[PDB]
Amino acid sequence: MNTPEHMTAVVQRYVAALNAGDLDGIVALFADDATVEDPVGSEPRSGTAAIREFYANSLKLPLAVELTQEVRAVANEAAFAFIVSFEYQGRKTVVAPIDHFRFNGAGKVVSMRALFGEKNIHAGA
């Protein structure tokens, strides 16, 4: 049963798994036929193996991710604002997206879409 409480719990488990580099913990949140479109507009990775590799690549560098506002949960859907920070060659970068999950009956994520553009990437020189 998809209650706002469950969907909010899932967003928190997702954010925490990213921080820990827990690939199994992230993949376990998705339906086997789920899709990920990161960022919006590109072509969606489909299925368990594609999704795992995507995150395996994202987690090449250590990410510090945190929710910046309350999670919005309603009718099998959740949206949340957060920031992902990482350093590279002495430069600290902060990506500030808004993600959107859609859950299935079983309470698993069937689709994920990360919305952010160049104006949401904040890196120094």
Place this chain on the structure above:
Amino acid sequence: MNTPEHMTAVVQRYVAALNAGDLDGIVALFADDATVEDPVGSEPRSGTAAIREFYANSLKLPLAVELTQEVRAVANEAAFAFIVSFEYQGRKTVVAPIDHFRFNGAGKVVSMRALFGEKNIHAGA
């Protein structure tokens, strides 16, 4: 041409029109065949006349709306966090949703979805 700058400008014009109770200014932002789903899950109002009435009802009470974070704009889509505040019978209420716009080629809004649930409605007693 839908540039992030245009889409961000539209979100700002939308938020300002709500604050002013400028119904023509809000409706002018949408495509004639646009849809509004407020909140997510319910049934979408379709077309210019339905959309105008919806907002005419929302604007029964004076709304104070403000963007709380940067607007996320990418590939014909924009998402933003904001709060709508209003008073009623001595009670101040704050709704904290995340809206999602999808633009057409002409740069007009073809669809709007407001995502927020009971946990995003913050009223006193």
